[PDB]
Amino acid sequence: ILPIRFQEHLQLQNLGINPANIGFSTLTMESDKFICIREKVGEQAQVVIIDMNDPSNPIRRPISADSAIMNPASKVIALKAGKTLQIFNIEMKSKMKAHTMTDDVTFWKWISLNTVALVTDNAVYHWSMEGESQPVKMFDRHSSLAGCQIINYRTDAKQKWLLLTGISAQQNRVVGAMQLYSVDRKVSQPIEGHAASFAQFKMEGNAEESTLFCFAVRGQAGGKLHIIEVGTPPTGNQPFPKKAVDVFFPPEAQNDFPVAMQISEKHDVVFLITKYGYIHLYDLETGTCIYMNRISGETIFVTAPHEATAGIIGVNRKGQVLSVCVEEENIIPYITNVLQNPDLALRMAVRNNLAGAEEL
Amino acid sequence: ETLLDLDFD
Amino acid sequence: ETLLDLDFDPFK
């Protein structure tokens, strides 16, 4: 028995997608609802829009953009060409918004249902789709990310804790550089890190949720995962006790590192995927490593939460669209009998309302 | 300048 | 000002 369930949703090559376009710069998956792929067929640049609820009928539309990112919930698409940003409602055949930046945008992403984050060489901006809003600067980039490839940007639910991640080569390894910014304190902290996520977690005995920051890093000394509360606990709350645990890489994976993290608040588990195809599952509360295995041959370069299973969905370089989630019938007996951790088993059974801890 | 062509059917 | 202490804190 395994504590996780793997599912293949699609092979993009079966829909006519050229594998040269299956990569970080040309394929975006901002949520589990859509995949957008920029392709050039003949003279014309196009975007192929895969609706994940109707995936055998992808729609191809001409574009003149260097990047396209679909809204997480709606057929509203953001496109850019150098400094020109445009937002379309596709069903309404409508240009919702147009904005001309004064810097090129190196990385952008939807950070919520109605806000796009824009990263330039020098700063990070948020742009709300509500009313007549324009981009607002959130913070200046820290010099520790200068020259990095920007690979992610995430926030907590209230958009008060902001996290920018870049990577570069130093001493012959991929080194991650993060910038954590507090909107309320107006302070940045540079952190060595590869992949991260925020999560809301209500501790037993607390009236209010804690906001947790979780990050994984392969440092010079080895792999580590941290789970730490950000900010002052809400009044009345006990503080969340911070956790730090090892992240294992086997001897043959000397050059592997973390590339993606998603946290299930249904099960309070952390999914971590590495560059070279390994999946790890950690308990959010303790950081206990529940499971590790190799699940892709190919590098997985983009992920999103998988809403239906409260798991993680991802696309690999072959064009396989794959999800991983907690196997709700197996996770508790796995932790009891294979990990031999009846304490964790019992806790998770009761915490997340899972069957199996009736015998320990 | 229009980055997406939606007149195309 | 730092936001987070990432090392073991015996005083909390």
Author numbering:
A (entry chain A): 4 to 363
B (entry chain E): 1 to 9
C (entry chain G): 1 to 12
Paper text:
Clathrin mediates vesicular transport between post‐Golgi membranes in eukaryotes and is targeted to specific membranes by interactions with clathrin adaptor proteins. A total of 3 consensus clathrin‐binding peptide sequences have been identified and structural studies show that each binds distinct sites on the clathrin heavy chain N‐terminal domain (NTD). We have solved high‐resolution structures of NTD bound to peptide motifs from the cellular clathrin adaptors β2 adaptin and amphiphysin plus a putative viral clathrin adaptor, hepatitis D virus large antigen (HDAg‐L). Surprisingly, with each peptide we observe simultaneous peptide binding at multiple sites on NTD and viral peptides binding to the same sites as cellular peptides.
